[PDB]
């Protein structure tokens, strides 16, 4: 608080803190009040906070279907060395987990997937076009209110929230991070594509395709399926930046996934290449034989 | 192409940042157009003196008009608003943003950093952090890309247009007309006045009104009206440029 919004339920706590939920009194709609702390410099609002938030508002005027809208923003608490900024948001009713959990399907469908994915890539390709790249691409940060929609969420935010690790938290659900995201810290756009195939698989029809914990543990977990790349496909440089220790080979896709189609295997492979360059494009994917 | 898709979006966003042409009547009590004239021209000198990125000034004026559209303000507190709008405009557009202290220096330290920073949240919050707004310059470049003119020529057009845009920004016109119009009217006045001095050269002038209004999707009489308004503003600089004595 405070804001010309009246909260209710509390749809989540996680990385971006508590994500409570409110109504818009003089609009009569639902709103997802998130929030963040930033430092009150001697030069006022963090230059990088004003710029980042500002850009997220430079989007609501595209009205793109498969992305959520930053509806409003408010810097509430000023105090020497800290300002609190509530990010008012568009409010979906449920997420991709609550979607795949309330799952009637025993394994299927595929046209509730092929569309649903060809959709997912859309919002991603948009956000990318505008130079936005997502960190926490997850079933938490994917959603649909009803009628099927797929409004991507918590986009960009990573930059705005750099001040979070002054709490050094929290969940760190590193199930989806790219082979670079914590083998280094590249924060490239392709790393945002990796997280796609990890959701692409998890949809058939279970739980995380690579959930573990340790950076290297997941890194090795990953090699199990794809196969350890020989050089020169091997980078640097820091943060227990292990070289090749456990030596492995290329394992079939449909193997541990029941069960990808002719292409569904081959595409998820293009998606999940190790080398971010010969990876796949957010768009070129969005028009593969798999459609 | 992506010309239209972006341009379409530019125009949408343009309308989400539009001020009220009525704010002096409806919102403001103390503040009058002549005072805004003084702050705008004060802001322009700062941007010039400080060699700011040229899109800073017209961006701050947008902020100022959209705020006066939302908040009543004591005249004593207008200059402070000018300052803040530049503070945020600069932070948005500059690799080396203006300093709050450097800004107050320009008021002869009439205002203070602490005040400035209180305003920044005022301003930013009133505008709902919708600050990556459009400027006339954003459109000028666009129109310029669509035009068959040698880079040498586009440089001169670009120069003159941005003069006009500044003229407009210190005028109430800027409140009535969105940057798209302001950009087109300025390009139209620029290219046309260049076609005169150098006939058979800036021949993009030829029915440029209809052309640019075809792009903006606007009544070409408004662009004609706008163009004239600008051409007059320019003349009114005949007065200022000389009377500095008494």
From Swiss-Prot, chain A:
In-chain residues carrying the UniProt-annotated modification Phosphothreonine: 168
Presence of keyword Nucleus: yes
Means of activity regulation: Full activation of the cyclin-D-CDK4 complex appears to require other factors such as recruitment of the substrate via a substrate recruitment motif, and/or formation of the CDKN1B ternary complex. Inhibited by INK4 family members.
Gene Ontology molecular functions: ATP binding; cyclin binding; cyclin-dependent protein serine/threonine kinase activity; cyclin-dependent protein serine/threonine kinase regulator activity; protein serine kinase activity
EC number annotated for this UniProt entry: 2.7.11.22
Domain of life of the source: Eukaryota
Listed InterPro entries: CDK, Kinase-like_dom_sf, Prot_kinase_dom, Protein_kinase_ATP_BS, Ser/Thr_kinase_AS
Cystine residue pairs: none
Annotated binding of ATP, by residue: 11-19, 34
Region (Required for binding D-type cyclins): 46-52
Cellular localization per UniProt: Cytoplasm; Nucleus; Nucleus membrane
EC category: transferase
Post-translational modification: Phosphorylated, in vitro, at this site by CCNH-CDK7, but, in vivo, appears to be phosphorylated by a proline-directed kinase. In the cyclin D-CDK4-CDKN1B complex, this phosphorylation and consequent CDK4 enzyme activity, is dependent on the tyrosine phosphorylation state of CDKN1B.
Annotated keywords: Acetylation, ATP-binding, Cell cycle, Cell division, Cytoplasm, Disease variant, Kinase, Membrane, Nucleotide-binding, Nucleus, Phosphoprotein, Serine/threonine-protein kinase, Transferase
Record-level GO BP terms: cell division; cellular response to interleukin-4; cellular response to ionomycin; cellular response to lipopolysaccharide; cellular response to phorbol 13-acetate 12-myristate; G1/S transition of mitotic cell cycle; positive regulation of cell population proliferation; positive regulation of fibroblast proliferation
Catalytic activity: L-seryl-[protein] + ATP = O-phospho-L-seryl-[protein] + ADP + H(+); L-threonyl-[protein] + ATP = O-phospho-L-threonyl-[protein] + ADP + H(+)
UniProt domain Protein kinase: residue ranges: 5-291
In-chain residues carrying the UniProt-annotated modification N-acetylalanine: 1
Active site: 136
Oligomeric form and interacting partners: Component of the D-CDK4 complex, composed of CDK4 and some D-type G1 cyclin (CCND1, CCND2 or CCND3). Interacts directly in the complex with CCND1, CCND2 or CCND3. Interacts with SEI1 and ZNF655. Forms a ternary complex, cyclin D-CDK4-CDKN1B, involved in modulating CDK4 enzymatic activity.
Task performed by this protein: Ser/Thr-kinase component of cyclin D-CDK4 (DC) complexes that phosphorylate and inhibit members of the retinoblastoma (RB) protein family including RB1 and regulate the cell-cycle during G(1)/S transition. Phosphorylation of RB1 allows dissociation of the transcription factor E2F from the RB/E2F complexes and the subsequent transcription of E2F target genes which are responsible for the progression through the G(1) phase. Hypophosphorylates RB1 in early G(1) phase. Cyclin D-CDK4 complexes are major integrators of various mitogenenic and antimitogenic signals.
Family: Belongs to the protein kinase superfamily. CMGC Ser/Thr protein kinase family. CDC2/CDKX subfamily.
UniProtKB/Swiss-Prot annotation, chain B:
BP terms from Gene Ontology: cell division; DNA damage response; endoplasmic reticulum unfolded protein response; fat cell differentiation; G1/S transition of mitotic cell cycle; lactation; Leydig cell differentiation; liver regeneration
Coiled-coil stretches: none
GO molecular function, one term: cyclin-dependent protein serine/threonine kinase regulator activity
One cellular component term from this protein's GO annotations in UniProt: cyclin D1-CDK6 complex
PTM section of the record: It also plays an essential role for recognition by the FBXO31 component of SCF (SKP1-cullin-F-box) protein ligase complex following DNA damage.
UniProt KW Nucleus keyword: yes
Subcellular location: Nucleus; Cytoplasm; Nucleus membrane
Keyword set, alphabetical order: Cell cycle, Cell division, Chromosomal rearrangement, Cyclin, Cytoplasm, DNA damage, Isopeptide bond, Membrane, Nucleus, Phosphoprotein, Proto-oncogene, Repressor, Transcription, Transcription regulation, Ubl conjugation
Location of the Cyclin N-terminal domain: 7-131
Recorded disease: A chromosomal aberration involving CCND1 may be a cause of B-lymphocytic malignancy, particularly mantle-cell lymphoma (MCL). Translocation t(11;14)(q13;q32) with immunoglobulin gene regions. Activation of CCND1 may be oncogenic by directly altering progression through the cell cycle.
Complexes and interactors: Interacts with either CDK4 or CDK6 protein kinase to form a serine/threonine kinase holoenzyme complex. The cyclin subunit imparts substrate specificity to the complex. Component of the ternary complex CCND1/CDK4/CDKN1B required for nuclear translocation and modulation of CDK4-mediated kinase activity. Interacts directly with CDKN1B. Can form similar complexes with either CDKN1A or CDKN2A. Interacts with UHRF2; the interaction ubiquitinates CCND1 and appears to occur independently of phosphorylation. Interacts with USP2.
Function per UniProt: Regulatory component of the cyclin D1-CDK4 (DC) complex that phosphorylates and inhibits members of the retinoblastoma (RB) protein family including RB1 and regulates the cell-cycle during G(1)/S transition. Phosphorylation of RB1 allows dissociation of the transcription factor E2F from the RB/E2F complex and the subsequent transcription of E2F target genes which are responsible for the progression through the G(1) phase. Hypophosphorylates RB1 in early G(1) phase. Cyclin D-CDK4 complexes are major integrators of various mitogenenic and antimitogenic signals.
Family under the similarity heading: Belongs to the cyclin family. Cyclin D subfamily.
The protein's name in its UniProt record: G1/S-specific cyclin-D1
Species for this entry: Homo sapiens (Human)
Lineage of the species this protein comes from: Eukaryota, Metazoa, Chordata, Craniata, Vertebrata
Gene that this polypeptide is encoded by: CCND1
Residues of the full protein shown: 22 to 267 of 295
